[PDB]
Symmetry: C4
Subunit: 293 residues, 4 copies
């Protein structure tokens, strides 16, 4: 048995694995930042790990181009000469292999972020349709915002229990919603209050608006904000440059239409064309356009 890389199954499988990479890009950074000390998420997370292992076996049973190559020896060698290393490191369950506290074991599952490479390889499939690349550009923006929300909470939570004298962003969140910390550094805002504030501040930093209630005070928070002003000015110019270019690509029929309509309209004015002829020129352009695009 072997799967053809252009078959309708392999198309549906690559679009299914895109959604499981988006699940990984959301819930791995979130669990590593907010949750370090069956449940519905624990069974879903195991299902997703099993499907990323099935995808390794499919990559030993799929054709490739040099026209098609269809022999299991030449297929398995092509995978071992390239991506099989990264696809295996993205799948080794170190949680079942290491014991050294459970903080390290829970953090080590960040190795799953190598699954983003399965989206970097397959841009030949995903970038073919203009409506699908708008979804990838908005998910790239919302995932850059989410990963920065996890780094920003890690930076805050590694300074909140310090000899901080109540200066870092989490102590100010405690005051601002009426949920102050105890003198022990314990209690205070919930995980929803802290995550929603960390995502709000990083969309605020990336889209360059500051409403004044969350702001960086410590040197680590200021250095993070300088880095997010550099990331924001590159990535927002590149992403919304590409979103504008793809919107201009989708609008390009109407953009060419109004341009050629203005040529015909201005030619009619310049020659002062009589009405019985004028209607025939304008109706002809509407016919020749709606026939040929």
């Amino acid at each position: 048995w072997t799967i053809l890389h252009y078959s309708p199954f392999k198309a549906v499988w690559d679009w299914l694995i895109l959604l499981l990479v988006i699940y990984t890009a959301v819930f791995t950074p979130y669990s590593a930042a907010f949750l370090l000390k069956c449940q519905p998420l624990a069974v879903v997370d195991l299902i997703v790990d099993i499907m990323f292992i099935v995808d390794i076996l499919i990559n030993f049973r799929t054709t490739y181009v040099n026209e098609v190559v269809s022999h299991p020896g030449r297929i398995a060698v092509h995978y071992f000469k390239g991506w099989f290393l990264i696809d295996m490191v993205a799948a080794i369950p170190f949680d079942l292999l290491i014991f050294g506290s459970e903080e390290l074991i829970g953090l080590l599952k960040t190795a799953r972020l190598l699954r983003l490479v399965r989206v970097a390889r397959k841009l030949d499939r995903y970038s073919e349709y203009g409506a699908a690349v708008l979804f990838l550009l908005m998910c790239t923006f919302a995932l850059i915002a989410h990963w920065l929300a996890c780094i920003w909470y890690a930076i805050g939570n590694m300074e909140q229990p310090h000899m901080d004298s109540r200066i870092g962003w989490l102590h100010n969140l405690g005051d601002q919603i009426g949920k102050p910390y105890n003198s022990s550094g314990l209690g205070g805002p919930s995980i929803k209050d802290k995550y929603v504030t960390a995502l709000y501040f990083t969309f605020s930093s990336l889209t360059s608006v500051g409403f004044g209630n969350v702001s960086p005070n410590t040197n680590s928070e200021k250095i993070f904000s300088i880095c997010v002003m550099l990331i924001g000015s590159l990535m927002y110019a590149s992403i919304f440059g590409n979103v504008s270019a793809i919107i201009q690509r989708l609008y390009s029929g109407t953009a060419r239409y109004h341009t050629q309509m203005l040529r015909v309209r201005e030619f009619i004015r310049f020659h002062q064309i009589p009405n019985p002829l004028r209607q025939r020129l304008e109706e002809y352009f509407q016919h020749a356009w709606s026939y040929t695009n």
Copy 2:
């Protein structure tokens, strides 16, 4: 009788209905957000509901293309298999169909917003002129800012009477203008203070400038601000992408004129054309340009 879809009457009637759709887009969300619990505005609201019913009668009596079709049976069946459902739901007077508190009758009149579809149906008329497209783009921006101001006041007003402990944006507005709420959660800012502050905050969010006085504190206000930063970055890349394109399209006389005058001037400097001949080249280009555009 029958109306031609290209007649000067049907042109004026479509440009009149645009102003009644802009009236609907302003005053229906405003009434549903700020006024729920005759005036000159109430008799005008009835007159506008009557004119949107008269427009259904005109749609049963207009010719259409699928060359023109003029037979009333083929007109009626095309409308009934087309927009008549949406046009009728936009015209139902729910005041006469429901009797069970008054708040349901007030809120259900948001079904009038289906009248926005009467603009999207007719972009062939409405988008023909660059001077009309600039008006529609700046009204679409100012209407998105207004609809978000109605949603932002609903989010504030659905938390202000709660067990809030004075954290939401309406309590802060009361303090910031010297109009605080009494212990019952009553009194506070006026409807003018609350509307002008909501509209100020959503233009502030959409144009990405935060002056620091209005800011989102509760998780619903932060999640709304995350949504307005996503909407605002797509909308500002699309609307102000198109507004600058329409400005540069209307500038396409001057842009070609400067570029061609520079090509001629650099040709003159490269060949070092003597003054007796040079003026003939530049005066010819001014004549040929002002003749041909």
Copy 3:
């Protein structure tokens, strides 16, 4: 006698009147907003008014085109039927003709802002050079910020002495700089403190950055800020759209040079041109480019 409109005198005079229009555009709005009830700014204002009256005599003695028309009667009729009405209204010496209080007379001298039309008439001269239209664009941006600073000070100063309860931007300025207003309306910030703050707030609003210290609190300050958010967005779609285009126009020879160099370079790589030949191709491109642009 008569002056030829292309002569070096008339060229130097038109570029001198641009500087006197820029003087008018700065110092008339400033005096009419900040300084309502010899010194250098009293005597220079008379010297400038005389030069704007001398310019009316030059317009009665200059050639025009409808080749040139040079007859003094056909010049005088062409000006009397054209711009002379506006140039006369922009010259009436109300200081010497009204006695009716000074608070009206100082405001009535804002009629001098009709001198801005003497620039709109002459864009054929002033737009000829790419470096001169960059100067007009940066002076237009700085003048829009200055005129808005005068409107923002008028809005602040027309509410500060009201039953305000210390809410308008001028009371907050007094508190922030350690120069508080007394309850009598006495003391408070100096005219430099009030002007530099109003110019800062309107560059802040137009470039969409809010540092959090000046913010609009009263309903008129919020309605002003909504107008500046609508102005600043149309202006960035237009002024900084044009500054981008003019900077790319100054860079256009170099932008074409790199584009054509990469086409030569990729042709050389695709054919793998040997070194003895390759230099003769890529040095010939540099010779042909530097010789001809």
Copy 4:
């Protein structure tokens, strides 16, 4: 001996002198602003001054063009009549020449910033590669943000020992991090706290976001922010205008590929091409594109 200006030694030397000009552009403004009244950095600072003197001797032995000129006497007089004056003043040992405080000597050594002219000359080398001009454009942005951070600290530090009355940005910093300034002016924020806050405020100002904690209060701070809103809106639009153009230039093969692929895709749909012929058309287009770029 003489060095050929195109040789692989002289290429590596000009890229090494770029990195030493970046060292000068960082550490000269910083030392003149923050460090005013051998050491591990003073040895590096001397080594770099030696290499900027060695570069003058290399320029007395480098060939030049008007085909190449090889003769040392024609080389020397061309350098003496050209850049030698600026290159020499950029290398005078001002450590040795004054006895007149260290406060003058540290200010005087800002003349080393004339080494930026060595990069302004050689843009024929440095701009050749698109990935090198991306590195230059992000270094120009980070260096403008750093030079402004040094001017902003010079403003705050010159006003702080005046009759400031706790209004200027450094007294606010002292309070906001819990390191308040003592009545004798001793202690307060460290040089890391003051520099990281100064750099944070200038990236904040240039990228037009204000998080509300650092803000300009005094008139000189506000006039500086007006200048950074002018410099920011010109430089950010020109730098990220050029980064946008360079990212589009590097992507241009793929942008052309999508444009031409969608012409072929629309042509195939318009003519309704059968599958046996369709595959031959689009497989030919991919074979052709991957061969010719």
